């Protein structure tokens, strides 16, 4: 019970953060992004396994969640590290792209504008490092509906992270009407992250590295 | 004042779209498509009746309407299907159960999302008042751009939120639960959005033109 307490939880998530990912480059832009995603996915699994109780869900839900959230969690990560630099998307330490470079590949420009706009909204709200940690945990725990309709366990966990986020906003010292508004504002943003995630998945499947199959392999590895 | 919690809910209540009968003299998709086109007209009316919507720049109005329509149709579908597991009450003469979804490829998947999301709103015991606020929110939160008149949209979105928060408050539940229920309701918005995208992808992969017809309506005003 206690390891899921608001304070402990935020610190545990903090330590569970993924490492920086160097793509190490010796079609191409899309080759880069794809190789990057594959690499991040490995660390994403590690991350999820470090979230208190995740490992104690049924392997069936762990797999459902991961398979449904990966693109969203990757994009949440992109937005967060691009949060202080308008017009750019810091994908990895050796891969910073600005809006315009998105014109090369067709279809990508639209997605970039979504990501940049959502990032802009997170910068305007002044997203906090610990609010960000809870949100990202929520994106995962809330990626799939089915595993909720072990379900007892997922719901408890999803409530834990939420209490944590509510706790985080509370010590913000702001009023009670604002606390509610900020909670609502942060959550509504999730719809946009999901959205961008869908446009990304769609675009990725309309393509002719196999990230999705590679993810399924990683899912079998465990 | 017209945006004050109690008043706003009653106003949204009166703005509800009428029942829509398709009146049937490929086909399933033909029906669903004829239905959408019809509901879209009433959806515009609905949105205009939301306090202050008509006051946003026509550019924002069009922007919001163009991206939320599918979500609002599905929020409507879920709400009227909420008491009937395994089925989707699309219209008074169009009730489809899950399996009828195997006929058209790609649709069974989407039906299962809608049935699951509806299933969850039933578990949360979504109230008629909450449903009214949530749907307004789906519209007001459909596009990020018009927000990043912006002043106006933000104020509007906050108004509906206060309303929802107000609604949950008179629920008499504790403050920890109030926060949880608010958070539980909002997260469902990601799934509605999700289903909305799957529905759009599918509709565009098809070979009635709802989207163009929508764009026309967007001009008739
Ligand atoms: O950290 C990351 C790493 C990678 C990505 C995705 O990469 C893709 C690859 C191939 C595609 O057809 C689409 C995409 C998504 C559209 C833009 C970025 C997004 C997000 C975040
Ligand atoms: O009230 C309504 C009326 C209509 C709809 C959409 O209709 C479609 C039509 C054509 C398509 O290729 C997909 C769809 C969506 C997939 C299931 C229903 C949804 C939702 C809600």
Ligand 1: distance of its center to the CA of B72 in Å? 28
Which residue blocks in A16-128 are alpha helix, DSSP H? 28-49, 59-82, 108-124
Contact B125, B200 (CB under 8 A): no
- Long-range contacts for B4-7 (Cβ within 8 Å, ≥24 apart)? B5/B162, B5/B163, B5/B166, B5/B167, B6/B166
Instruction: Tell me how far the alpha carbon of residue B202 is from its chain's centroid.
Output: 18
Distance CA A40, CA A80 (A): 15
The DSSP string of chain B is -TTSHHHHHHHHHHT-----------HHHHHHHHHHHHHHHHHHHHHHTSTTGGGS-HHHHHHHHHHHHHHHHHHHHHHHHTTSTTEEEEETTEEEEGGGGSSSTTHHHHHHHHHHHHHHHHHTT--HHHHHHHHHHHHHTS-SGGG--HHHHHHHHHHHHHHHHHHHHTTT--HHHHHHHHHHHHHHHHHHHHHHHHHHHHHHT----HHHHHHHHTT--
Contact B57, B64 (CB under 8 A): no
Distance CA B82, CA B131 (A): 11
Ligand lying nearest the CA atom of residue B98: 2
Contact B199, B35 (CB under 8 A): no
| DSSP 8-state code for residue A18 | P
Asked if A67 has any chain B CB less than 8 Å from its own CB, the reply is no
Contact B88, B40 (CB under 8 A): no
Contact A70, A215 (CB under 8 A): yes
CATH number reported for the structural domain that contains residue A134 in this entry: 1.10.565.10
Contact B140, B64 (CB under 8 A): yes
Nearest chain A residue (CA) to B120: A149
At residue A85, the 3 state secondary structure works out as: coil
Distance CA A67, CA A219 (A): 8
Ligand 2: distance of its center to the CA of A220 in Å? 35
Of B141, B179, B191, Cβ closest to residue A188: B141
At residue A116, the 3 state secondary structure works out as: helix
Helix (H) / strand (E) containing A186: helix A176-205
Nearest chain A residue (CA) to B178: A180
Whether A76 is in the pocket of ligand 1, judged by its Cβ within 6 Å, is no
Asked if B124 has any chain A CB less than 8 Å from its own CB, the reply is no
Q: How far is CA B221 from CA B44, B68, B217, in A?
A: 10, 17, 7
Total domains in chain B come to 1
At residue A93, the 3 state secondary structure works out as: coil
- Nearest atom of ligand 2 to the alpha carbon of B39: 1
- Nearest atom of ligand 1 to the alpha carbon of A112: 17
The structure was resolved to a resolution in Å of 2.5
Of A138, A188, A198, Cβ closest to residue B189: A188
Technique used to solve these coordinates? X-ray
Parent domain of B23: 1-221
Q: What is the CA radius of gyration of chain A?
A: 17
Q: Which residues contact B90 (CB under 8 A, 6 or more apart)?
A: B31, B32, B35, B77, B96
């Amino acid at each position: 019970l206690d390891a899921l307490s608001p304070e402990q939880l935020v610190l545990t998530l903090l330590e569970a953060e993924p490492p920086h990912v160097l793509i190490s480059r010796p079609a191409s832009m899309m080759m880069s992004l794809t190789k990057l995603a594959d690499k991040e996915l490995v660390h994403m699994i590690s991350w999820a396994k470090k979230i208190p109780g995740f490992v104690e869900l049924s392997l069936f839900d762990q797999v459902r969640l991961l398979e449904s959230c990966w693109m969203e969690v990757l994009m949440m990560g992109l937005m967060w590290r691009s949060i202080d630099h308008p017009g750019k998307l810091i994908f990895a330490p050796d891969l910073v792209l600005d809006r315009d470079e998105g014109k090369c590949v067709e279809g990508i420009l639209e997605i970039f504008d979504m990501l940049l706009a959502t990032t802009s909204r997170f910068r305007e709200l002044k997203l906090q490092h610990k609010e960000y940690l809870c949100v990202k945990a929520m994106i995962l725990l809330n990626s799939s509906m089915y595993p909720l309709v072990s379900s007892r366990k997922l719901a408890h966990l999803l409530n834990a992270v939420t209490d944590a986020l509510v706790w985080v906003i509370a010590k913000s010292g702001i009023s009670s009407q604002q606390q509610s508004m900020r909670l609502a504002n942060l959550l509504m943003l999730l719809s946009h992250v999901r959205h961008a995630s869908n446009k990304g998945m769609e675009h990725l499947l309309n393509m002719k590295v196999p990230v999705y199959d590679l993810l399924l392999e990683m899912l079998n590895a465990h």
